[PDB]
Amino acid sequence: KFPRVKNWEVGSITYDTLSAQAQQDGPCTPRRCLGSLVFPAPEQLLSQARDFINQYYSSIKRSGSQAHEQRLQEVEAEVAATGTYQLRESELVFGAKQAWRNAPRCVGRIQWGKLQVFDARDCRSAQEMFTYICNHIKYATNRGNLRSAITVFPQRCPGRGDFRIWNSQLVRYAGYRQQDGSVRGDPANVEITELCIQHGWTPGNGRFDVLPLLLQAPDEPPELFLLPPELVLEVPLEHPTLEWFAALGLRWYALPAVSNMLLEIGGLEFPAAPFSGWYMSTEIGTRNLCDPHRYNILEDVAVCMDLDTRTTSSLWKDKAAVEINVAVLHSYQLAKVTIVDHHAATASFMKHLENEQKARGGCPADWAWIVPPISGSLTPVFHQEMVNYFLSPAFRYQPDPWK
Amino acid sequence: KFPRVKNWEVGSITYDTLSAQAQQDGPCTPRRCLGSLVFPEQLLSQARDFINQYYSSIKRSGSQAHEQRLQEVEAEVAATGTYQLRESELVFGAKQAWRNAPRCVGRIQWGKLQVFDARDCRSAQEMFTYICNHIKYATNRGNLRSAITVFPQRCPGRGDFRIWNSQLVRYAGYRQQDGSVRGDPANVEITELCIQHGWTPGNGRFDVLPLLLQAPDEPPELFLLPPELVLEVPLEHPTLEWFAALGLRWYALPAVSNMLLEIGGLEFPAAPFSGWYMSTEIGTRNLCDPHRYNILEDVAVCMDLDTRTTSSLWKDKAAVEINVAVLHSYQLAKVTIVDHHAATASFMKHLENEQKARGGCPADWAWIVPPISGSLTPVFHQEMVNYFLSPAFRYQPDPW
Ligand code: HEM
Ligand code: HEM
Ligand SMILES: N=C(Nc1ccc(CCNCc2cccc(NC(=N)c3cccs3)c2)cc1)c1cccs1
Ligand SMILES: N=C(Nc1ccc(CCNCc2cccc(NC(=N)c3cccs3)c2)cc1)c1cccs1
Ligand SMILES: C[C@H](O)[C@H](O)[C@H]1CNc2nc(N)[nH]c(=O)c2N1
Ligand SMILES: C[C@H](O)[C@H](O)[C@H]1CNc2nc(N)[nH]c(=O)c2N1
Ligand SMILES: [Cl-]
Ligand SMILES: [Cl-]
Ligand SMILES: [Gd]
Ligand SMILES: [Gd]
Numbered sequence: 071k072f073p074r075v076k077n078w079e080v081g082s083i084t085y086d087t088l089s090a091q092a093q094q095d096g097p098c099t100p101r102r103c104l105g106s107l108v109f110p111a112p113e114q115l116l117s118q119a120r121d122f123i124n125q126y127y128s129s130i131k132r133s134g135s136q137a138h139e140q141r142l143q144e145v146e147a148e149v150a151a152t153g154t155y156q157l158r159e160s161e162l163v164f165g166a167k168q169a170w171r172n173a174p175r176c177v178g179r180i181q182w183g184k185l186q187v188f189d190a191r192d193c194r195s196a197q198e199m200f201t202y203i204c205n206h207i208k209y210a211t212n213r214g215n216l217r218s219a220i221t222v223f224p225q226r227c228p229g230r231g232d233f234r235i236w237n238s239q240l241v242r243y244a245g246y247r248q249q250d251g252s253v254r255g256d257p258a259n260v261e262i263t264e265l266c267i268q269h270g271w272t273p274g275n276g277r278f279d280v281l282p283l284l285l286q287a288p289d290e291p292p293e294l295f296l297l298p299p300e301l302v303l304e305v306p307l308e309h310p311t312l313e314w315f316a317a318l319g320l321r322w323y324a325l326p327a328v329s330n331m332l333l334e335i336g337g338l339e340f341p342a343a344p345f346s347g348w349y350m351s352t353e354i355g356t357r358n359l360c361d362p363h364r365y366n367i368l369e370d371v372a373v374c375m376d377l378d379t380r381t382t383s384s385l386w387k388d389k390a391a392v393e394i395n396v397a398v399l400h401s402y403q404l405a406k407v408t409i410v411d412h413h414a415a416t417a418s419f420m421k422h423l424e425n426e427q428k429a430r431g432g433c434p435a436d437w438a439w440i441v442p443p444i445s446g447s448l449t450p451v452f453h454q455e456m457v458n459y460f461l462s463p464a465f466r467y468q469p470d471p472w473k
Numbered sequence: 474k475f476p477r478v479k480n481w482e483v484g485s486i487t488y489d490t491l492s493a494q495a496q497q498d499g500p501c502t503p504r505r506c507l508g509s510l511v512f513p514e515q516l517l518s519q520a521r522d523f524i525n526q527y528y529s530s531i532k533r534s535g536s537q538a539h540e541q542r543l544q545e546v547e548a549e550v551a552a553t554g555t556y557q558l559r560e561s562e563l564v565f566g567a568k569q570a571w572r573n574a575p576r577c578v579g580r581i582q583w584g585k586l587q588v589f590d591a592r593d594c595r596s597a598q599e600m601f602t603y604i605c606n607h608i609k610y611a612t613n614r615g616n617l618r619s620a621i622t623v624f625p626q627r628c629p630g631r632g633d634f635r636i637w638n639s640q641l642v643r644y645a646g647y648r649q650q651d652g653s654v655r656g657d658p659a660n661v662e663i664t665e666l667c668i669q670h671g672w673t674p675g676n677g678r679f680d681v682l683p684l685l686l687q688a689p690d691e692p693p694e695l696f697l698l699p700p701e702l703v704l705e706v707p708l709e710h711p712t713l714e715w716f717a718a719l720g721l722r723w724y725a726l727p728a729v730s731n732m733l734l735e736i737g738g739l740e741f742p743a744a745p746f747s748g749w750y751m752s753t754e755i756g757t758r759n760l761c762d763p764h765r766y767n768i769l770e771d772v773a774v775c776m777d778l779d780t781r782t783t784s785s786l787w788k789d790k791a792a793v794e795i796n797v798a799v800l801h802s803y804q805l806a807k808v809t810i811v812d813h814h815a816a817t818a819s820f821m822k823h824l825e826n827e828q829k830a831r832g833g834c835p836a837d838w839a840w841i842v843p844p845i846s847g848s849l850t851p852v853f854h855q856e857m858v859n860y861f862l863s864p865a866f867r868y869q870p871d872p873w
């Protein structure tokens with residue numbers, strides 16, 4: 071038997087047959103579930119490459135064709151001669167889309183088929199890397215009409231260091247570890263800020279200072295590049311009916327572009343493959359602005375809203391958090407920057423689940439990450455049971471290049 | 474082998490060593506996590522294990538009385554096939570089963586539980602008296618007190634005491650000739666049973682259901698709850714004067730009556746327990762779930778919210794004011810209730826106490842994090858380990 075999966079809003083029942091294809095292992099055992107944790111060789115290369123090629127040729131409905139066999143033979147011969155192999159361009163595009171499709175913590179996978187894949191596997195230097203990244207930022211920002219993209223830098227290979235982007239995203243605000251223990255700017259970026267200053271960046275002193283990019287070419291210390299200010303589209307935050315909100319001087323950036331994850335395709339590894347989509351509004355409104363360990367503006371806003379913050383039972387937190395999220399959505403819509411609210415995102419994810427059940431017999435999904443951080447049970451994904459497992463091609467965490 | 478558990482708000486680290494004592498097996502494997510699923514004469518070994526637990530907790534470990542109790546239960550099961558709990562063992566086993574319940578955010582309170590020993594019960598008319606005394610004690614005119622009543626255990630060659638209702642207080646669910654449900658859709662099945670067993674149905678959205686109590690080997694008998702025994706809170710809102718006219722209400726006492734209590738290999742299919750509500754249970758789940766009363770759009774219409782675009786966050790604004798109404802209405806009626814911020818702060822304290830007490834604490838993140846304002850509560854940022862300890866409250870098949 072395969073896991074029986076139930077939607078409790080509808081009563082409907084599916085079986086996740088796809089999970090039985092899970093290659094790598096997760097952190098859970100029959101004795102204990104660790105699903106809530108944030109952080110969970112010629113012959114082994116070949117069976118991963120074979121499986122990936124099988125996936126490619128299924129996607130185009132040419133399984134068992136002559137072209138399928140020849141390509142498997144081709145990969146085998148290259149691995150036997152060199153210990154490794156090169157993806158065809160079409161396989162790279164397919165592999166990056168599958169990795170997105172396979173990502174269990176991504177609620178935006180209804181879009182997985184619409185992904186611009188920039189092939190930067192011929193990149194030679196940190197300077198050319200910066201050029202690829204600027205072109206990515208320009209294409210994806212598209213002056214507010216955001217377009218999903220990934221740029222794939224050269225694969226890891228023996229006898230040469232990795233390409234790495236040290237920043238966790240292409241656009242990050244500085245976090246200045248103030249001496250009195252506190253932080254000015256984004257506390258999530260204190261470490262990368264200190265590394266940037268360490269490498270000669272002249273720091274600012276604001277709360278929304280865009281960080282430079284620390285770019286690492288093989289066997290080279292990271293190099294500092296400043297993003298052209300006209301390349302970094304930002305949204306000033308205001309609230310549709312709370313006019314004093316604008317005076318908080320809050321901003322956020324248009325483009326979420328994760329740059330520190332490793333892309334794995336057919337046993338090949340791409341330690342530098344930054345990817346971007348668009349924001350779901352709770353990421354900015356609830357997490358980035360109201361996490362106690364982030365900008366932590368909740369109490370300041372509620373006090374401005376004249377709420378009774380002396381008792382929890384007034385729900386001043388819930389009320390201020392809702393208005394902050396309203397401000398984010400209003401501000402991005404006003405600026406004409408693509409953004410999706412958590413209701414539409416989770417509804418579209420529910421559609422994705424139904425498509426994937428028909429297409430592949432299941433969908434790896436991490437409930438705790440799919441359910442938005444406010445209003446969870448008001449969205450349909452709350453009531454959907456979900457099976458979490460690791461498929462390849464995949465986006466993976468990897469150690470920071472300085473640790 | 475000891476899982477590392479991190480709090481991402483504070484950056485603190487602990488190690489759950491208690492998980493190594495997980496007796497049963499959950500649904501997860503290294504291949505796939507099923508954590509989000511709602512439903513995941515060796516009696517001696519379990520009986521042995523619980524006794525050791527007991528005497529260890531009272532610092533009587535391996536003492537004279539320890540070995541004596543051990544040898545008593547061996548004779549009982551040899552003579553009868555089962556054994557009898559001492560009243561103190563039963564109290565300790567009830568408290569431990571609550572303390573071990575991974576999905577309970579209310580466990581800061583676990584040492585304060587009134588155990589009613591109903592194991593001398595026979596016939597459903599007596600069940601009903603035990604239950605009514607439970608309901609009366611636990612309600613306490615609104616100053617709610619946690620309690621469990623423990624009816625006779627299952628044994629071979631003989632039926633079971635079962636409470637057919639999932640809770641002692643449930644509103645009726647009446648299906649309509651247009652398919653819809655007037656009342657609580659969660660209770661459409663027990664409502665048709667109550668009718669099929671003679672109950673005159675109401676026609677209201679908050680008709681309190683009768684109790685279908687079942688003594689062993691007999692059909693269940695309908696018992697009507699004295700309306701003065703069932704404390705109910707009419708729902709009003711502190712500033713939205715029209716909210717009261719919606720006619721919403723809920724009941725004071727959450728009393729779960731369909732779970733099985735397991736202690737030392739013994740099984741009590743009828744052991745209703747009650748505490749008090751966390752406000753999001755009523756204001757978010759019971760009233761705003763699509764498959765329950767589903768009142769969200771009604772409230773948003775009364776608030777004159779723009780309901781044609783999700784991005785107005787009309788669902789979020791309506792949900793908050795409904796939870797406000799619940800908190801205001803219970804406090805105004807002097808019925809104990811806890812908001813999700815106070816409860817999750819208390820559960821965090823419980824986690825620290827349990828870390829020091831036992832080296833960990835089984836917790837089901839998906840159920841501990843509230844259904845609104847998740848990341849505004851500290852539990853959201855707390856990694857958790859889920860595992861099954863005994864004594865335990867377990868799900869069980871419906872009697873029919
Ligand atoms: C197109 C619009 C998209 C939306 C609205 C979206 C939404 C989200 C959200 C809300 C998260 C959780 C982030 C967090 O809480 O830190 C997430 C995670 C993730 N997203 Fe998507 N995403 C989109 C596109 C993409 C694309 C284009 C890719 C890759 C090609 C991608 C891959 C991932 C991955 C791998 C994760 C997991 C990251 C982790 O484990 O930390 N997403 N996404
Ligand atoms: C004292 C105040 C208490 C509060 C505020 C509280 C709160 C909660 C909440 C919010 C849930 C989730 C229920 C749901 O979402 O359906 C829960 C579950 C649970 N509670 Fe507590 N509870 C309390 C007392 C108790 C007591 C006295 C017991 C037993 C002696 C108990 C045993 C359980 C169990 C076994 C579950 C799991 C239910 C399931 O898996 O369906 N709780 N509690
Ligand atoms: N950074 C840490 N913790 C940590 C914090 C957050 C995350 C999650 C990373 N998420 C950023 C992200 C990922 C994926 C999507 C988004 N948001 C988006 N909408 C998109 C980004 C790209 C395409 S869509 C944001 C992981 C570890 C650590 C502290 C100490 C050691 S590691
Ligand atoms: N039973 C179902 N599913 C299901 C639904 C809810 C739960 C959770 C149990 N709900 C009642 C409950 C349990 C525990 C605590 C509370 N609330 C309380 N605050 C307390 C109750 C007793 C002491 S505290 C409510 C489990 C399974 C089904 C639906 C349709 C067919 S079967
Ligand atoms: C402890 C817990 O795993 C952690 O706070 C998770 C919960 N769910 C999440 N879900 C999303 N989308 N993003 C997150 O950062 C987190 N954090
Ligand atoms: C599918 C999912 O497991 C289900 O909806 C769970 C999620 N978390 C929950 N948490 C609580 N407290 N109560 C619930 O009923 C649920 N339902
Ligand atoms: Cl972000
Ligand atoms: Cl309830
Ligand atoms: Gd105004
Ligand atoms: Gd009106």
Ligand SMILES: [Zn+2]
Pocket residue numbers: 098102103104105501502505506507508
């Ligand atoms: Zn698990």
